[PDB]
Amino acid sequence: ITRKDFDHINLEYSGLEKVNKAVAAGNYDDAAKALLAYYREKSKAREPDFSNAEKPADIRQPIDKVTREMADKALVHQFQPHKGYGYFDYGKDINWQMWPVKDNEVRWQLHRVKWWQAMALVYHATGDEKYAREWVYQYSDWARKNPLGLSQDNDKFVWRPLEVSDRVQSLPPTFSLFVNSPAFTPAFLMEFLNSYHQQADYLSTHYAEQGNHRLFEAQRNLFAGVSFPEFKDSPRWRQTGISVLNTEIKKQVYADGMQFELSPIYHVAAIDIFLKAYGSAKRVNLEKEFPQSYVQTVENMIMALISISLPDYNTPMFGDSWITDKNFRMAQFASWARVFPANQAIKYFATDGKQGKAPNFLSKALSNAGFYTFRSGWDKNATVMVLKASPPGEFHAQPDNGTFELFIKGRNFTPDAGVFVYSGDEAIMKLRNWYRQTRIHSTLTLDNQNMVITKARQNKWETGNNLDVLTYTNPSYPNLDHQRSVLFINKKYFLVIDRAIGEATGNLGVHWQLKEDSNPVFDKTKNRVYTTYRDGNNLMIQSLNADRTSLNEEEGKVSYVYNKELKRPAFVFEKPKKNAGTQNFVSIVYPYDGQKAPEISIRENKGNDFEKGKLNLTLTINGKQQLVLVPLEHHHH
Template sequence: MKLKKILPFLFIIASTILLNAQEKPITKSSFDNINLTYLGLEKVNSLYTAAKYEEAANELLSYYRNRKNIKHPDFNIGDEARFRGKDIGKANQVKADNALEHKFQPQKGYGYYDYGKDINWEFWPVKDNEVRWQLHRVTWWQPMGMAYRSSGDEKYAKEWIFQFRDWAKKNALGLSKENDRYAWRPLEVSERTQSLPGTFNLFVNSPNFTPNFLLEFLNLFNQQADYIPAHYSAEGNHLLFEAQRVLGAGSIFPELKNAEAWRKSGIEILNREIKLQVLADGMQWELSPTYHVASIEIFLKAYNSAKMAGVAKEFPESYVKTIENMAVATAKISFPDYNNPMFGDSWLNEKAGRIKQFQSWAKLFPDNKLLKYFATDGQEGATDFLSSALENSGFYTFRNGWNAKSTVMIVKAGPEGKFHAQPDNGTFELWVKGRNFTPDAGCYIYSGDAE
């Protein structure tokens, strides 16, 4: 047999040996965070009680590989056919393939950087704090899962499992204050708890996803979800993200012992903060259209997580009504291309993505004709007004129509905003016949070195 034919086999064997070498032994304590009395875990509990821990772990993996009652919004067990052989998009494929070579794009405003064969999670290629923080959101893991679903190529599964373990080892909580500041900032921890369940579903049926790895995954996920309530941000959109995601963690993995406490914590904070952060006209108090829409998504995702967990009644009717008011406010300050003025820390968005958001909002509020109009790109629904004033936030929109040829001017003249607001009163953006003639500069980077 020629060397060219032998090398691939040697690589596969070496990879398998490396993965097995990383396996941690399964012991009684491996199950400490799992509620073995949870409905559906009877066989697992029986084997655990009999001290058959390896067999219990095998049964637990079988449970998760067949679990279909818990629905993830994007990736679920049993929907493999939706991805098999399908194009996952150029951007996702590039992320997945670059990740195989440890070339990561921590922040989309920058390019890809090589983090080394032995991944250096402390590498700081650009002195922008967001690059260091957002590295730990590991946003390329989900595209790796999508590439795996599409191709069936185990190289993606093996590499993801390797990276997961490598991250856990090199970024363990408490290794250093400096590293904790980036890897364990509550916002980044919450981002991981939100993205990991989808990645889990994408990879769980891989033969490389072993019972040992399952317990490693669940225990690290548990540690991160537990960490958030004890380290909530004081206020602002960070707090909203963290509360929504800890609620989601308790809904997507109800088998974990602290799942109910996570759900209660998230619901309590969101019920409080929606009253505090959303003004009477429906705008979020940071007065940034970008973060306003992000807040809508937070409140809506939280509500949907609560519905999945059967606790939606914990949100009062006023909570849902406020979400509707926020969505309507977004429509009022939209240009014909579905962009909003870049007041505060804001940036442009893609029309297709914004229509998708309006579709999710219109689904919750089917009787709202304005939301239906935006959800269908003007094909359905209705607009029964032109100009509008959001007096509490100071967003004033003057328009003579709703189509691309209309003239639309949006003026900012409101109170001092929070966090992502800027001192931009008096700023306006003017749209005429298909073009924005006076776009605001939006935001650049939040922080970095003197350069």
């Protein structure tokens, strides 16, 4: 209504031509209507962006029963602020300070005003003005009753940056859905714009300098500037959001695209934070403000996920990670496909292979995180191994370097034991720590003890049609390095070479685990274990050591989801390390069809020298010889 109400708006912004000329002429009412008309036209030019929320509210999913309930209860001022509680009545005159229960979160979360998006959604679906009338009334009510500075009680609960950020993110798509209502007056527009501006600018001067709040607070501040770029401050809001996101992406994700905590499931969650900020900006052609390196890195994060994805769409259960829902994952890829629409691999993953193209690579190293995928292809019956030989992680990572999941013709033969449980009671902690033991993973131990760190150095990585080769060294114990080489041969089978290097003496164990239903045979005469699946899709793991080596079965368990566990087969090839001399293991991991395990022997040829990394072996497999001639190390003049 007044001149002051246009102070935060950039009147020379493209579209506001009539608003500026009207404010210049003192015709403020016409200026507001001209602004409303601009905003109405703008709202019709695009869908409302709901994508940024943790659960994106779909505009076209038929109005859920829970969503319609929330919008109808809001008409009588019954609100469900908090998901862990039911509805409360806040009165015909809304008491925003009410204490329905003695719990701070119920007050904080009330001011996330979740039900406004429900009212907007139901209004869009029905076209029923009662929802729009009530919302315009409720925002005005909220604004006039909860101004910044009202009291230190109310500021604490209404103007905490977290809630403020939640509102700057939720309000734009709500606005978009209500702005075309005749209940949305030109005066309410100005009350809303000036209230929204106060909140976004407050956020820009209050976002956290560090911690688990920093990311979404700055991200949401960028969204404010993306959603209402007409404010004078908007460019600055976008810049500060972007620089924080950018600083953090460079800190939290490696050059290979993998997120620093080394858990596939937390890697996936991280994609969404960094990707949605870019995607929301791109929808309105403001994405050029992101540096190229940011955009490249986000795409690399998706490509990294694709590389470690098994044919069932699950990722290996390394550290704190678990099995997940294929349909939901496909919807995630579909959301990502909209942002990177030229990428045929993302489209392929979005549509279960029906559209797009298989990724332009097979076996692949993520060399900073130390995730190595050996794969025959991307089809449903591919042989895929993902192996972890990583740098140090934190809470969500385990002492498991060397371990791997091997997926063959629809079956995961060697699922990681998993997490089982979060941190909690001392009794619950002993269980968590059982699952963090090295000895229950597919790698080498000394006296069955946990390795002291995961700090792999890659010695060699080479891909090829007929042969992929990995060699890395982990300092598993202070007096003992573990060097492991993995050879993927003829896209069919694996040779695993383990070397225990250093002064340490004791019992060396190379451990292996199998799927709960594999009912394996343990053959101590030939030091081989094989599964007995009736469908004939089977696996043999055999020690090819020339020196004395024992085979013993061990306690094994696998947890696919929290609080659920299954007994499963486990075993170890063992031999003593009597002195400071290096000890070598040669193991074959050999998939086969049928009920008859292959007969495999080995001959070390002249020129074979594990110390030099010169592998020169002849494997005889069911009577037929084949040469394995491979250098295990590189840069060794």
